[PDB]
Amino acid sequence: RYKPDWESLREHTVPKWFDKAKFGIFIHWGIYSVPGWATPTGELGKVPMDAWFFQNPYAEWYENSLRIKESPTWEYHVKTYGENFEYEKFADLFTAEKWDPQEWADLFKKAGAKYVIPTTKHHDGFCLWGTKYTDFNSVKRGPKRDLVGDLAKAVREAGLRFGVYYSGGLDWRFTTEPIRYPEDLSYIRPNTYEYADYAYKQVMELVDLYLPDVLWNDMGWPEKGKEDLKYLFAYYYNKHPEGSVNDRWGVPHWDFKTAEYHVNYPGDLPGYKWEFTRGIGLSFGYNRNEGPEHMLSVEQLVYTLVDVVSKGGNLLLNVGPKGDGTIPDLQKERLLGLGEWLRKYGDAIYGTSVWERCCAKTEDGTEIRFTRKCNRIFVIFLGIPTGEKIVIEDLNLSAGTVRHFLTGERLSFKNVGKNLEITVPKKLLETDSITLVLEAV
Amino acid sequence: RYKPDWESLREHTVPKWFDKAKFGIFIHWGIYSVPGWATPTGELGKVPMDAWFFQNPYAEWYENSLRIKESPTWEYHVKTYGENFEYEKFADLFTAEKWDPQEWADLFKKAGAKYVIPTTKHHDGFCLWGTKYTDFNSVKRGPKRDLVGDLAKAVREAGLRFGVYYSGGLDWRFTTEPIRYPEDLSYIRPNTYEYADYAYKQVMELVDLYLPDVLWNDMGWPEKGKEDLKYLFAYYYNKHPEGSVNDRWGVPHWDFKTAEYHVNYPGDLPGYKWEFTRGIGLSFGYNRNEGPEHMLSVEQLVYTLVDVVSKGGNLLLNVGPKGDGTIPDLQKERLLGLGEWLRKYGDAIYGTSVWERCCAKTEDGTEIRFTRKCNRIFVIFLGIPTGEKIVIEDLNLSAGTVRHFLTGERLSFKNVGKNLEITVPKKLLETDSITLVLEAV
Amino acid sequence: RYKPDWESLREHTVPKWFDKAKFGIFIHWGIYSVPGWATPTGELGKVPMDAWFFQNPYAEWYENSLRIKESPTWEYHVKTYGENFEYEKFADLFTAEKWDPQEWADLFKKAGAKYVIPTTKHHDGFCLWGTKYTDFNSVKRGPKRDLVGDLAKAVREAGLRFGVYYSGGLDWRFTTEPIRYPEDLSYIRPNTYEYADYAYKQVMELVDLYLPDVLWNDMGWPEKGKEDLKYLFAYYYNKHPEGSVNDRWGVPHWDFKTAEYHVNYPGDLPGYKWEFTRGIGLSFGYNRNEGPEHMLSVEQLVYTLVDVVSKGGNLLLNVGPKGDGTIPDLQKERLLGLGEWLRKYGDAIYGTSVWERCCAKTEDGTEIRFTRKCNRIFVIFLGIPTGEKIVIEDLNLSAGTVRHFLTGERLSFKNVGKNLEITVPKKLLETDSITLVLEAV
Amino acid sequence: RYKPDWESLREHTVPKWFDKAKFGIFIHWGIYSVPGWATPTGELGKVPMDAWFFQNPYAEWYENSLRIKESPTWEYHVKTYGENFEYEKFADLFTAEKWDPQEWADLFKKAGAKYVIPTTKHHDGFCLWGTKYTDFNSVKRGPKRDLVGDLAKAVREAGLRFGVYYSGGLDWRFTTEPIRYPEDLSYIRPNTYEYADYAYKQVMELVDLYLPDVLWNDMGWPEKGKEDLKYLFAYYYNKHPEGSVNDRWGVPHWDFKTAEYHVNYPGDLPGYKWEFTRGIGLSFGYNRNEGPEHMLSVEQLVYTLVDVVSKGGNLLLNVGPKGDGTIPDLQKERLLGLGEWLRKYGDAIYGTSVWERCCAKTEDGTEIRFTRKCNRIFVIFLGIPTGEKIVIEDLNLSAGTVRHFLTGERLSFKNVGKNLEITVPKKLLETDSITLVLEAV
Ligand SMILES: C[C@@H]1N[C@H](CN)[C@@H](O)[C@H](O)[C@@H]1O
Ligand SMILES: C[C@@H]1N[C@H](CN)[C@@H](O)[C@H](O)[C@@H]1O
Ligand SMILES: C[C@@H]1N[C@H](CN)[C@@H](O)[C@H](O)[C@@H]1O
Ligand SMILES: C[C@@H]1N[C@H](CN)[C@@H](O)[C@H](O)[C@@H]1O
């Protein structure tokens, strides 16, 4: 058994299934999906933090932006919904009338994802399950439905792993003042013993009702409640050894680390398992203001996934549904495009390990990423070279046999100085889709 | 911004407005005002503590006295209200039917006060505002009115600062046993995590609804809740830099210290800002048993204010209203008398600083106090000398010019040995009211 | 860079070299090696603990035993050396006259060990390096030599890893009373801040002088110094990322766990990296009283090694040299025997991983262990069966090819029900040494 | 009496003498003054921190730099003094052969400084007084003299205040590894209880032997000794109420805050007392590599002083003497230049307070700073305008009288819109030295 102390909990390491999964789907869905609006300012890590909360690109932070008067959100809300329409009132408009969880589960499976993590409770404190610790939840208001539960059944039916996102660090149902500057986060928090118990009780309830594969907390865990985690993590691991927790609790234990947009993104192999998360656009929650110009293209999603994976992480790509339970076409098309590349190149991604190095580039700048499966080394070009002669800078191979991944064709190569030169017939280059993939043995 | 740690909060010092205000009005008003009764035994610091709680002069401690059977209060209650009339039941008789907050605000302004602090919640735990954390409050019972709110508007309308008194340390809604000896205070306290959250939540709510100029806590802050103060004080100071807190929280920070009757009263300059508090009589809450013999006279209020001020403090003088919202004539007349002296001598009090020394006396025992305004030194006699020749013991002046404050008349003086001799024409002595005031430059 | 906090230090996991090494050599050597005497009572975990300290089989515990009057050690010592003969005096008799560090390293490399960990300081507080925090060390006393540094240089020149053992939890130079019962360990420890500093300073010193590959602490870390380990570990990992620490510090962090004789020995796959340690006999320090009846035979060492590796562990086999620095023949022969077995079967041990299960057994009781290297599964029998027909219980293989490891010869097999049947030609069974080994692909 | 608790110690505020003094002299002098060498890379706050320790402009950090092999210091040292030349050896070469404490004090009083604070012990752990806790001090080594005591006696005889600087947070006599990156500061510290005692004992010793006016700690206080400061501070204030402490202890209490070069420099009125410190050049310790290109000119010192004072701070200007105890001419000339300016404009600096605003500027870009003394407002231009017509932006005065400070001559002025227009006769503008100064009443 695991014991409730960090030294014992340290015995639990990231489960094998998570390490091999590589790709998961995040879902930021809640009453903020109804107004579904934000100023698409930029990417976290690139937007100056002196402005960020005033021009917040995260549509799920709508309530916080609403509280800052004369924030673009406040202007939009007053003209659209009125000055007398409290944020909470969106719970009545959040109906999920067109929601079909098996349809989501199928799209995620078709997209190539192996696990799904919905927001059970984001910062606004609204719970997407029939929690018994608050009436501000989807069973008592809005959908009159247990979204977390119904989605967990659908996802598991599709054979995917199901995890839960919980906002332990923030709950605007316990504060009145908005966050305007990063500094405010140091003191505008629930702060009470009451809140530390609520958060513990709610995650315990998520463990009891759905036994999730991942406990993905956000924004730290209330200080007064930190010692509780030893007990919660043991309780969880004893019911579900293959369960896993992220690194946003602020305590000694975690099974995998996280990076969000530019924030904490590794430049090379990090030495521990991690997971990169971002939305398809600049928001997590649905933003009606984003168009294709604010979103990654299929190509960029593939290069992204490849880079993350060659560095040992998983890609946790966020989908932001509308209040009605539908997934916007722009998102769906990107997911399906990724799923297509994965159906074709999945073997060089899933179940792979990192190699000695993650990266290389060709003489004319095409980036290259590596992954491994025992003796097999996959060479994944972020792009398809135009000519047949390829020169990879700073790489030698002692394999004696390099093949073209898709066809299996054995190819001609040789170590030329500090480089590796290979000839790939144009007929093969023409068969690859977004990436030229080679396999060295 | 202020950060939630004592080292950062230390940057906040007493606001300039508070330091210059000199005089404020305390208001102990609540359901204890209805029975409005106590044995006027004596002054805190003079009554032996082995008897104090059994013959409590603080009428606001009525409930605690009621719980000690065979306490004079218990005898009075049973004969007047009956053995079956619970203390809580007074909330139904507390109607404030004759209450006029603008009338109070005007009396306080006329009295010369610059800030007003009502009891939002005293030890009996009854809240004079529509708090959402208890139904034992003035909006749900008694007046069916938000007294703190309506009084805050009235006081601000009169141009005075508004602060709030909160009993963080005691709440008899969380205990059953009475305090009989000082020792009991060490353990008869709410004690729960629940109470530490309630107190934090209620002061946060007072900050949110009324943004007070002073947070005047009493009886210490619950131990389990002490770390919360770093967050509460930062939250408060960031919303209201010019806000201020007293020294009864039991934590590193405070903006000004307090003395109550004889307790902690400085004998000379203390080196930090402080505030002296007391009722006009021996109680804070209305005591129908006090007559003029238990109250300070206008003269004694003036000497009091002068002494406090010459030592760097403010006088926080308590008014105890009746259950109907009226202020007893004996109190009102003393307030107005003080206001009259202040209209005349205000310039030697308001906005002043301490001098090198606070005190001196005349050859025949008249006490003298000093205050300052840059180069101007005010010499305030606690009384009006009979003869024209005045000899101040142990004082020399290097001003070359001493005037009679009221008229401006230049007077004749000279340093005679270790003394200062001055001649004040009887026509001038006859114009002064309760104090001879001289001005040296 | 690792930061000095548990959450950050958790980013460091057991290094690859340690995971792949499988076999290392422990060396308990010090002044207790001079008397080299204990009553070989039995194995830790089997001998009742109410008798253990009184008849301690760990010869390195001689001083503690000596402190227990009329314990077999007391009597032996008084009869051999006399009552006017303090334990410390052995420091002067510890001359290591015949020590040859390169011979030790040649021997351990021949035995098949990939790392060596000598006792730099055992419970008696005698230090084997020229420490500057105590004069009770090998440079000042006895050998007049830096034993730790000289062995480190030889071990590393032989191509092996070098770690250090340090008794952080016990130091008899700071106590006077012996440990008589397990409970005594809870209060009879140095206990002072002075000792906490000393232990911190000496491990830091080992790190700065030798930068070891393993920091092997024993008996917990002084409670007063536990917070220091956050800094010590970050400082160490920042200078040597491939460095490692065991799990006897009593803090949140460790890279691998440990089991001693029967204590904490896993019966199955534990799920984290660990290391098994024990003496070739029943003691760690040299014991002239042990005969071959008290030691493991080469066959049992092989079986011990295999069991350990199949379960994900490393064997840290202890060698106990004499005071003159020679390794007793009984131990050298067993080391060589194991080295020989490893020279034949090494490929199925070094660099392997655990399989789905660690263990099986034939229909006739022969135990089997499994190890893995990608698609290759090693089937290691703990013995060599007599008949060519072998029936393994409760096992089915989906390999389609099962070879005899040493010869590489393809073997006939089929899954018969819930069993696996293999025919091993007598010629092949005769080729194997202590273990029949098969390889499935 | 102050009690040893933060709430009580908070009763002590910055003393009047320190608030009124405005200008003091810092002295970084020790054995590092002998090599007196650094690469004058730039100012702290501008030089990237990933290069700063490798090209440290603080010559007093010589030992740390020397510990970084092939850092410009390492190379310089090996070429000048050799590889067989330990840093400690400079202690013997530090002879202060030409030191004359009264000459130093005469110089600082001429410069206009009101207090002097020498380094009693910098990061290298060398002590400049006959401490009894270490032999690595000036009485036993090099000068054979109590530098701290002798300078204290001379400074005080010159009529100035005397404080002491102590490196509580760093002492390289307890570490071996150099600081290479800012992060290293989080774990490379003495860390022991022994060090916490030593630091406590030495500051106590400074207090008992010299009763300094300022306790200037640097680099935080050892975590294990932070609770000791409650006692140290009470003990100190009880012996010397006018004593003071800076804000580099990392505990709740401090009397004034600090800013170093660009680090923590306020752009406006901070609201608490503070002190700015920096070298005349880019180093604190003497650096023979600095020329006048690396130093502030007399004009910039004046401007620095004014900016600081207008914002409520004091300037603690650092002087870096040579190993022989003489102050380099480049520094002595700038000290004298500033002293001259202070002899003319002192009345607008010493004893002043901040005004409503610290700053303004003319229509043509000349910066202006304000200071106050009761009803007098000093308008200090950072330069001397060329034209007699001066237009100050965004300022209106209700004084009715504006004089030219040096001559006292009444000037013509009027508020023109949102500006202030003054005519300063060319004769007067020519009388001023580095700053045009006006006085409004
Ligand atoms: C995955 C993202 N995490 C951030 C907190 N860093 C959230 O604020 C954001 O809304 C989203 O949930
Ligand atoms: C101002 C006074 N403070 C005391 C606590 N010392 C209270 O017990 C009393 O009722 C009144 O509120
Ligand atoms: C490896 C062994 N560890 C035990 C501590 N349980 C020691 O008591 C013993 O001396 C030996 O060092
Ligand atoms: C005044 C300056 N303080 C810094 C510490 N930040 C020191 O590193 C430097 O040597 C000098 O003493």
XYZ file of C-alpha atoms in Angstrom, chain D:
441
model
C 11.852 48.709 27.135
C 11.311 46.873 23.854
C 10.366 43.230 24.300
C 11.708 40.540 22.020
C 8.719 40.222 19.780
C 7.920 41.747 16.365
C 4.771 43.531 17.585
C 6.754 45.282 20.287
C 9.852 45.984 18.124
C 7.479 47.681 15.637
C 7.204 50.530 18.254
C 10.745 51.511 17.133
C 10.785 53.637 14.021
C 13.578 55.138 12.010
C 15.242 57.657 14.318
C 15.030 61.423 13.579
C 18.758 61.820 13.130
C 18.800 59.268 10.305
C 15.744 60.755 8.618
C 17.317 64.270 8.748
C 20.934 63.236 7.906
C 20.313 62.491 4.178
C 23.916 61.637 3.314
C 26.264 59.029 4.675
C 29.483 57.347 3.615
C 29.778 53.565 3.016
C 33.248 52.054 3.228
C 34.022 48.678 1.623
C 37.547 47.851 2.767
C 39.252 44.569 3.423
C 41.844 42.162 2.082
C 40.197 42.244 -1.341
C 41.342 45.871 -1.431
C 44.862 44.550 -1.959
C 44.332 42.998 -5.307
C 41.770 45.804 -5.924
C 40.706 44.370 -9.310
C 37.477 43.702 -11.290
C 36.258 43.996 -14.865
C 34.135 47.207 -14.687
C 31.340 45.507 -16.689
C 28.470 47.867 -15.775
C 25.784 48.664 -13.211
C 23.809 46.130 -11.151
C 20.353 45.866 -12.716
C 21.630 46.371 -16.284
C 24.236 43.603 -16.630
C 22.494 40.260 -17.456
C 22.611 37.931 -14.440
C 23.771 34.903 -16.466
C 27.070 36.797 -17.019
C 27.286 38.993 -13.877
C 29.180 36.556 -11.556
C 31.535 35.649 -14.370
C 32.482 39.272 -14.985
C 31.755 40.723 -11.661
C 32.246 44.513 -11.450
C 32.229 44.331 -7.541
C 35.981 44.059 -6.785
C 35.101 43.037 -3.250
C 33.797 39.771 -4.840
C 37.341 38.911 -5.911
C 37.512 35.596 -3.984
C 34.226 34.347 -5.432
C 35.458 35.379 -8.919
C 38.799 33.740 -8.247
C 37.005 30.518 -7.394
C 35.471 30.509 -10.921
C 38.394 29.104 -13.012
C 39.071 31.051 -16.159
C 36.853 34.007 -15.150
C 38.739 37.202 -15.889
C 39.710 37.216 -12.168
C 41.215 33.755 -12.270
C 43.450 34.704 -15.206
C 44.448 37.998 -13.760
C 45.296 36.430 -10.437
C 47.342 33.553 -11.887
C 49.295 35.983 -14.015
C 49.860 38.515 -11.232
C 50.170 36.460 -8.058
C 50.376 32.859 -9.247
C 48.441 29.634 -8.767
C 50.173 28.790 -5.431
C 48.681 31.998 -4.014
C 45.515 31.494 -1.867
C 43.114 34.359 -1.440
C 43.584 34.291 2.367
C 47.230 35.297 1.865
C 45.992 38.842 1.034
C 45.178 39.114 4.774
C 48.904 39.275 5.447
C 49.478 41.815 2.714
C 46.710 44.044 3.982
C 48.900 46.377 6.075
C 46.980 49.697 5.949
C 50.452 51.259 6.152
C 49.196 54.761 5.468
C 45.890 54.684 7.233
C 44.905 57.688 9.260
C 41.372 57.391 10.658
C 41.127 61.122 11.569
C 42.073 62.077 8.020
C 39.201 59.766 6.796
C 36.773 61.371 9.192
C 37.895 64.916 8.263
C 37.408 64.023 4.619
C 33.833 62.572 5.145
C 32.773 65.530 7.253
C 34.102 67.878 4.455
C 32.101 65.846 1.916
C 28.982 66.722 3.847
C 28.305 63.177 5.234
C 26.549 62.812 8.569
C 27.266 59.135 9.192
C 29.858 56.540 8.290
C 29.393 52.784 7.830
C 32.429 50.613 7.274
C 32.356 46.902 6.330
C 33.230 45.099 9.648
C 33.020 41.775 7.754
C 32.253 41.271 4.075
C 31.410 37.999 2.267
C 34.975 36.709 2.463
C 34.557 36.492 6.268
C 37.594 38.650 7.129
C 36.846 40.729 10.231
C 38.082 44.285 10.756
C 37.850 44.280 14.569
C 39.523 42.110 17.205
C 36.622 39.615 17.300
C 36.991 36.714 19.621
C 35.142 34.292 17.369
C 37.690 34.153 14.657
C 41.425 34.636 14.177
C 40.803 35.699 10.583
C 40.673 39.355 11.663
C 42.647 42.643 11.338
C 44.099 42.534 14.892
C 45.708 39.115 14.259
C 46.497 39.476 10.589
C 47.670 42.291 8.350
C 47.005 45.699 9.986
C 47.534 44.363 13.543
C 44.878 46.855 14.434
C 41.211 47.294 15.409
C 40.110 49.139 12.278
C 36.458 49.235 13.285
C 37.140 50.671 16.757
C 39.701 53.202 15.602
C 37.496 54.477 12.825
C 34.497 54.594 15.191
C 36.471 56.789 17.652
C 37.621 59.194 14.819
C 34.214 59.413 13.106
C 32.512 60.200 16.432
C 35.138 62.736 17.429
C 34.433 64.482 14.062
C 30.808 64.690 15.230
C 29.390 62.091 12.823
C 27.242 58.982 13.455
C 28.911 55.525 13.119
C 27.205 52.357 11.912
C 28.485 48.907 10.930
C 27.992 46.730 7.894
C 28.051 42.949 8.475
C 27.680 40.213 5.900
C 25.222 38.061 7.768
C 23.981 36.200 4.741
C 27.278 35.151 3.173
C 30.582 34.004 4.552
C 32.974 32.262 2.142
C 34.963 30.849 5.013
C 32.043 28.355 5.279
C 31.544 27.416 1.615
C 33.793 26.150 -1.131
C 31.822 26.543 -4.308
C 31.471 30.000 -5.911
C 28.204 31.699 -6.761
C 27.904 31.441 -10.573
C 24.250 32.224 -11.079
C 21.672 34.122 -8.988
C 19.992 30.709 -8.210
C 23.126 29.419 -6.456
C 22.426 31.967 -3.686
C 19.469 29.785 -2.691
C 21.681 26.857 -1.525
C 25.320 27.968 -1.392
C 25.361 29.594 2.056
C 26.975 28.452 5.319
C 23.582 26.637 6.226
C 24.714 25.376 9.647
C 23.534 26.084 13.191
C 27.176 26.819 13.923
C 27.109 29.696 11.406
C 23.825 31.060 12.749
C 25.457 31.284 16.234
C 28.598 32.849 14.878
C 26.707 35.593 13.001
C 24.549 36.240 16.138
C 27.610 36.336 18.391
C 29.549 38.692 16.122
C 26.721 41.239 15.707
C 26.154 41.120 19.509
C 29.877 41.731 19.912
C 29.739 44.770 17.605
C 26.809 46.060 19.635
C 28.654 45.534 22.983
C 31.985 46.974 21.790
C 30.902 49.885 19.627
C 27.155 50.359 20.160
C 26.712 51.420 16.508
C 24.083 53.845 15.234
C 23.164 51.561 12.354
C 23.226 47.806 12.003
C 23.621 47.368 8.249
C 23.205 43.616 7.472
C 23.591 42.305 3.961
C 22.342 39.252 2.028
C 19.689 38.194 4.474
C 20.149 36.538 7.824
C 20.797 32.744 8.222
C 17.406 31.069 8.325
C 18.320 29.179 11.474
C 19.136 32.450 13.244
C 16.121 34.569 12.175
C 14.286 34.032 15.488
C 17.452 35.337 17.241
C 16.933 38.791 15.666
C 13.859 39.339 17.947
C 16.313 39.227 20.877
C 19.235 40.942 19.151
C 17.025 43.880 18.111
C 15.434 44.292 21.559
C 18.855 44.068 23.238
C 20.228 46.673 20.806
C 17.304 49.140 21.007
C 17.205 48.812 24.782
C 20.868 49.914 24.964
C 20.520 52.456 22.151
C 17.000 53.625 21.278
C 18.368 55.895 18.561
C 20.103 52.929 16.959
C 18.709 51.637 13.655
C 18.574 48.573 11.403
C 18.249 48.207 7.568
C 15.974 45.759 5.741
C 18.296 42.941 4.685
C 17.587 40.532 7.558
C 14.574 38.865 5.993
C 12.418 39.217 9.161
C 9.377 41.374 9.937
C 11.333 44.313 11.311
C 13.517 47.075 9.752
C 13.759 50.836 10.260
C 14.596 51.774 6.623
C 14.668 49.980 3.321
C 17.491 49.889 0.741
C 18.060 50.013 -2.992
C 21.397 49.250 -4.742
C 22.179 50.792 -8.125
C 19.093 50.087 -10.222
C 17.798 47.323 -7.874
C 14.624 48.473 -5.971
C 15.134 52.082 -6.949
C 11.843 53.956 -6.472
C 10.569 56.099 -9.335
C 8.389 58.105 -6.951
C 7.522 58.709 -3.261
C 7.752 55.198 -1.665
C 5.983 56.003 1.599
C 8.549 54.691 4.108
C 12.101 55.678 4.851
C 14.823 54.159 2.575
C 18.446 54.565 1.612
C 20.183 54.361 -1.758
C 23.611 52.986 -2.048
C 26.185 52.648 -4.794
C 29.858 53.104 -5.473
C 31.376 56.323 -6.836
C 32.230 53.800 -9.638
C 30.660 50.362 -10.473
C 32.326 48.531 -7.563
C 32.224 48.919 -3.805
C 35.697 47.601 -3.129
C 38.575 49.472 -4.652
C 39.060 48.672 -8.363
C 42.299 49.929 -9.957
C 40.634 49.210 -13.369
C 38.122 51.940 -13.104
C 38.856 55.265 -14.721
C 36.730 58.412 -14.583
C 34.624 56.872 -17.464
C 33.286 54.387 -14.890
C 32.522 56.909 -12.249
C 29.863 59.457 -11.599
C 30.971 63.045 -12.076
C 30.375 65.533 -9.274
C 27.313 66.781 -11.179
C 25.762 63.313 -11.377
C 26.436 62.776 -7.647
C 24.605 65.990 -6.878
C 21.694 64.936 -9.087
C 21.688 61.463 -7.544
C 21.684 62.941 -4.060
C 18.784 65.307 -4.910
C 16.659 62.643 -6.612
C 17.134 60.362 -3.624
C 16.299 63.020 -1.046
C 13.230 64.305 -2.897
C 11.900 60.743 -2.710
C 12.461 60.529 1.089
C 15.709 58.596 0.926
C 19.278 58.995 2.160
C 22.250 58.463 -0.106
C 24.791 56.012 1.322
C 27.681 56.725 -1.112
C 30.426 54.131 -1.113
C 34.121 54.868 -0.946
C 36.601 52.059 -1.735
C 40.046 52.595 -0.048
C 43.284 50.948 -1.136
C 44.977 48.228 0.869
C 47.357 50.867 2.324
C 44.392 52.768 3.620
C 44.481 55.760 1.318
C 41.449 56.864 -0.580
C 42.123 57.057 -4.391
C 42.234 60.580 -5.801
C 39.405 59.962 -8.244
C 37.118 59.262 -5.298
C 38.443 61.977 -3.024
C 37.832 64.684 -5.707
C 34.231 63.668 -6.277
C 33.665 63.525 -2.464
C 35.040 67.089 -2.186
C 33.025 68.341 -5.170
C 29.807 67.068 -3.520
C 30.892 68.484 -0.200
C 31.265 71.950 -1.855
C 27.774 71.724 -3.439
C 26.333 70.713 0.017
C 28.078 73.641 1.700
C 26.134 76.000 -0.630
C 22.811 74.111 -0.955
C 22.684 72.117 2.250
C 19.779 73.972 3.787
C 17.503 72.580 1.012
C 18.638 68.948 1.719
C 19.508 68.246 5.408
C 16.501 68.149 7.694
C 14.017 68.298 4.828
C 10.877 66.252 4.160
C 9.243 65.239 0.945
C 6.614 67.484 -0.596
C 3.334 66.402 -2.335
C 5.332 65.386 -5.311
C 8.990 64.620 -5.797
C 9.369 65.659 -9.337
C 8.701 67.938 -12.330
C 10.399 69.149 -15.448
C 10.631 72.305 -17.532
C 9.108 72.661 -20.959
C 12.579 72.050 -22.377
C 13.391 68.812 -20.537
C 15.309 69.942 -17.402
C 14.344 67.764 -14.467
C 13.237 69.269 -11.173
C 13.022 67.860 -7.629
C 11.317 69.244 -4.552
C 12.101 69.118 -0.822
C 10.385 70.810 2.075
C 10.935 72.462 5.437
C 7.597 73.500 6.885
C 6.195 76.260 4.680
C 9.334 76.494 2.536
C 9.441 74.438 -0.664
C 12.800 73.972 -2.352
C 12.729 73.710 -6.169
C 15.936 72.043 -7.272
C 16.742 71.947 -10.943
C 18.960 69.205 -12.175
C 21.144 71.622 -14.043
C 21.112 75.340 -14.700
C 18.798 76.540 -17.421
C 20.180 78.853 -20.101
C 17.245 81.286 -20.534
C 15.803 83.641 -17.899
C 12.363 82.481 -18.825
C 11.585 79.173 -17.208
C 8.441 77.187 -17.810
C 7.698 74.319 -15.390
C 5.200 71.802 -16.705
C 2.102 70.757 -14.837
C 2.685 72.832 -11.739
C 0.820 75.687 -10.035
C 1.892 77.376 -6.767
C -0.218 79.066 -4.177
C 2.780 80.673 -2.458
C 2.729 84.211 -3.740
C 6.456 84.426 -3.129
C 9.254 82.567 -4.947
C 12.854 83.492 -4.108
C 16.163 82.529 -5.696
C 17.750 80.352 -2.954
C 21.417 81.432 -2.849
C 20.808 85.215 -3.100
C 17.395 85.289 -1.451
C 16.177 87.575 -4.262
C 12.377 87.675 -4.766
C 11.370 86.448 -8.223
C 8.511 87.080 -10.617
C 6.171 84.263 -11.255
C 2.636 83.374 -12.261
C 0.626 80.222 -12.964
C -0.119 80.144 -16.697
C -2.652 77.445 -17.258
C -1.441 74.050 -16.193
C 2.131 75.474 -15.991
C 4.262 77.732 -13.793
C 6.316 80.567 -15.272
C 9.253 82.116 -13.499
C 11.800 84.579 -14.720
C 15.238 84.042 -13.313
C 17.599 86.987 -13.959
C 20.780 85.838 -15.774
C 22.897 87.297 -12.950
C 21.216 84.874 -10.576
C 21.369 81.906 -12.914
C 25.096 82.552 -13.089
C 25.523 82.590 -9.368
C 24.345 78.923 -8.992
C 26.736 76.052 -9.209
C 25.343 72.756 -10.534
C 21.723 73.273 -9.746
C 19.457 76.228 -10.080
C 17.579 76.318 -6.784
C 14.480 78.268 -5.970
C 12.580 78.522 -2.758
C 8.803 78.975 -2.684
C 6.999 80.151 0.492
